[PDB]
Enzyme design. Structure first.
Site: not given
Ligand code: HEM
Ligand SMILES: O=C(CCCCCn1ccnc1)N[C@@H](Cc1ccccc1)C(=O)O
Ligand code: HEM
Ligand SMILES: O=C(CCCCCn1ccnc1)N[C@@H](Cc1ccccc1)C(=O)O
Lengths: 443, 449
Positions: A256, A381, A388
């Site tokens: 990411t 994030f 994140c």
């Molecule tokens: C531009 C860089 C990054 C982006 C856009 C990004 C984006 C995200 C997003 C959208 C989520 C939420 C996922 C969800 O709700 O299912 C997430 C969760 C997370 N990210 Fe990132 N991330 C980045 C960089 C990083 C880095 C550098 C690390 C570790 C050093 C990291 C570790 C994590 C972890 C551990 C979570 C889960 C947090 C929790 O649910 O407790 N990410 N990230």
């Molecule tokens: O849209 C997505 C994108 C996945 C998100 C990226 C995950 N991430 C988070 C932080 N770093 C990576 N995922 C759906 C697709 C789907 C919809 C309906 C039925 C089957 C599959 C899913 O997995 O359910």
């Protein structure tokens, strides 16, 4: 009140719509046609894709919605286990690891990582300084080299030495191939794929478990994880979960971020006025051969550039939620307990009612005042307590690296590169190449 | 190792530095010049003012430091007695009242107070609805009317009826004048102050008589949803004892004191920052309009006012209305690895300076940005201390924040606000902080109650 739905394929419902190599971009086009919300059905699954700030601001109410594991995250869980990113909020190991790891990811903790981040950043600059005339840079390839090495070094004092390699480390070869299998499982005799999946997991587990045992004091996440105790339960993480967190960080904290740097440089060379303004700030602020931690914090416009790149192409392009109880979305869409939502982040970030008519234009100035931005309009994030944890890690690394890049080189879009966004579980501009003309400023 | 100290006045040492009508702001300017710690001496007094999170996080270690009664609190003790705020941790009545009163102040307990809070909040909104065109609002005055009446009603089912009055209730005249005498004694003994002594004692009796009469009248036996009922019927699980009637009066006096001016200052500072930052006001007003969909807010709806709470925390960051607390070293110890302290040595935590520690908050510490509080986990431990520390932290924190969130939410739902005088921030100092002379105009949105 009645919710739109894209075209169906009989018993397969909407699932074949995702059998495409750019599914996020396909889902964006569906949102363009159907609007702020549409139902999406697959065999044994129903979800709803949200695209407007109007509805997503309600979805981000943590009293009404909690993080759901998408099918993609469920498949990643097969090797990320109950690490932070693939665990449910109600699992004991989420809050436990959350409390333990939060201090090691703070803005204040970046001060301790800064020297190791500069270590890798200097290696990137030196690689580009050492190119011959007419040679070019493979941007996402080199950005991934940097972000992988940075998290390996800051995470558990391990040098992947990506800038010494053409063929990546065997660990990430399995990791990338495991992530590819996880994604391809979504879009679906396959017995070989299963054997391949387990071999790639074993490659990851063995290496990580070796490093933990070898270690069992430095300024890395591993030390914090071995010695940290949850203030709530009083317990430390067990060794199995610690391995999962390391795997999670290696996944979650390289691709990411490298996508962010790649998209940022893409947008800069496509917008020369913005590049000039960012380069002027870099020269004005980065007056020493090595940037300091405080200096990086002064690269305000570079930080705006990164946020605007995250607006247009958030590299983790979606997250999933479920309704904690029966509730009504937007006063029109009643949801039952357990009903699922997907937040389509790139479409949210194109909501004209928030950003104006010029949503497709790259304007970092949009982010000059965070208070002028409505609630939950910008979610690169994630949201709330499941946001994140590495946000400040990612932004400090990217600001440091982009600042040094803009200080030391002029960049040329020598191929007039046509944006082609490759989709794995993340987004990156495939084939993006530039030429860098050194400004001959020593390190 | 060598500790800075501000200018001295011969035998009076630093004490005349406090002979000013804005002492907290003067101490803030001294901290700006001297840094994270400076010694402050008065005749028969030595303390050390802490301003950095680095040192204050150690001071907040309850194994090494306990709550000390500042001179301000010692003077308040002459009428607040051994109530919760003016008692030492080792006094039997602190832990006793703490155990008895903690359940009646929980986030869960706010559900029972909510209706009484709405009662007073509706009176405030109706007053502003009933103003004539080009009439204006005296903000801290009306906020004090609201928070005093709210604690009176939720505290012991007594209606001060402040919105029916120009001159406050005779209890409140005595309380403020007693607080003034206590604060004035720090600035200050000779015959000139003798009238002060007789007046102080007259004000003490006024407070005691009203409170003691209310306690005696209730002990009719009726039950209301107030702290007084809880205090008459509650028993400490440890000692098995209930509070005696004397300590109950001290607790009632304490609640009326401790929980009216700090809360009204918060609401006043919050509205000030809102009208000075229209982007923030618009964002907060959108939430209030979206969440408060009923003519009367519910408890659950108030909990949904996330951005309003962010506004309140950011107002508490810049101007914490109880701006300091005091500590003493339980044993010999070294602070920050360079400042050795002996047992009994005193510390003051200068909260407004702590909240301006650039090493925690960045360079924009003076800017009003509620988005700092968008995710609470990004805030380091002991960087944000508007409600004190540990077991001696503010027991009324949840009460104050629920009241302030409800009222500010209703204010933003029902009115547009105009800073018609381009008000210049003037912070009046008693034992608490408030923006003196802050006035606005409210244009009703014509939304019925
Ligand atoms: C531009 C860089 C990054 C982006 C856009 C990004 C984006 C995200 C997003 C959208 C989520 C939420 C996922 C969800 O709700 O299912 C997430 C969760 C997370 N990210 Fe990132 N991330 C980045 C960089 C990083 C880095 C550098 C690390 C570790 C050093 C990291 C570790 C994590 C972890 C551990 C979570 C889960 C947090 C929790 O649910 O407790 N990410 N990230
Ligand atoms: O849209 C997505 C994108 C996945 C998100 C990226 C995950 N991430 C988070 C932080 N770093 C990576 N995922 C759906 C697709 C789907 C919809 C309906 C039925 C089957 C599959 C899913 O997995 O359910
Ligand atoms: C925004 C509003 C408020 C602020 C900023 C505030 C601040 C504080 C602070 C800093 C302390 C610690 C004092 C010290 O360490 O010497 C404290 C203690 C206390 N406060 Fe508040 N307070 C507020 C509202 C209230 C309310 C509404 C009540 C009662 C309903 C209340 C009752 C008390 C009591 C009883 C204590 C002493 C607790 C103990 O030591 O056991 N306060 N407050
Ligand atoms: O700093 C203060 C401010 C008092 C804090 C307000 C008390 N509060 C707490 C909750 N609601 C009110 N007080 C010092 C001043 C002083 C220093 C040295 C010598 C004499 C006086 C003191 O009283 O000791």
């Amino acid at each position: 009140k009645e919710m739109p739905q894209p075209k169906t394929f009989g018993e397969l419902k909407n699932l074949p719509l995702l059998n495409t190599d750019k599914p996020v971009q396909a889902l964006m086009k569906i949102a363009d046609e159907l609007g702020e919300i549409f139902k999406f059905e697959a065999p044994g699954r129903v979800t709803r894709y949200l695209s407007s700030q109007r509805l997503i601001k309600e979805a981000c109410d943590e009293s009404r919605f909690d993080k759901n594991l998408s099918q993609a995250l469920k498949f990643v869980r097969d090797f990320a286990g109950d690490g932070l990113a693939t665990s449910w909020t109600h699992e004991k190991n989420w809050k436990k690891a959350h409390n333990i790891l939060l201090p090691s990811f703070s803005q204040q903790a970046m001060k301790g990582y800064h020297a190791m981040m500069v270590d890798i950043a200097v290696q990137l600059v030196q690689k580009w300084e050492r190119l011959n005339a007419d040679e070019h840079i493979e941007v996402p390839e080199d950005m991934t080299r940097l972000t992988l090495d940075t998290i390996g070094l800051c995470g558990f004092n391990y040098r992947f030495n990506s800038f010494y390699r053409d063929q990546p480390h065997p660990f990430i070869t399995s990791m990338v191939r495991a992530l590819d299998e996880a994604m391809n499982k979504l879009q679906r005799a396959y017995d070989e794929n299963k054997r391949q999946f387990q071999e790639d997991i074993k490659v990851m587990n063995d290496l990580v478990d070796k490093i933990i045992a070898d270690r069992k004091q430095s300024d890395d996440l591993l030390t914090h994880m071995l010695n940290g105790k949850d203030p709530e339960t009083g317990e430390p993480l067990d060794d199995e979960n610690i391995r999962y967190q390391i795997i999670t960080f290696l996944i979650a904290g390289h691709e990411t971020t490298s996508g962010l740097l790649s998209f940022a440089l893409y947008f800069l060379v496509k917008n020369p006025h913005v590049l000039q303004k960012a380069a002027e700030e870099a020269a004005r602020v980065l007056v020493d051969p090595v940037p300091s931690y405080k200096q990086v914090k002064q690269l305000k416009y570079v930080g705006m550039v990164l946020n605007e790149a995250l607006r247009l192409w958030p590299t983790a392009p979606a997250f999933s939620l479920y309704a904690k109880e029966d509730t009504v979305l937007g006063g029109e869409y009643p949801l039952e307990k357990g009903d699922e939502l997907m937040v389509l982040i790139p479409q949210l970030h194109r909501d004209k009612t928030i950003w104006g008519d010029d949503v497709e234009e790259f304007r970092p100035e949009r982010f000059e005042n965070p208070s002028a931005i409505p609630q939950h309009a910008f979610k690169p994030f994630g949201n709330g307590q499941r946001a994140c944890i590495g946000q400040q890690f990612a932004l400090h690394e990217a600001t440091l690296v982009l600042g040094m890049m803009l200080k030391h080189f002029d960049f040329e879009d020598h191929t007039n590169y046509e944006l082609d966004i490759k989709e794995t579980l993340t987004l990156k501009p495939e084939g993006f190449v530039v030429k860098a003309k050194s400004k001959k400023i020593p390190l």
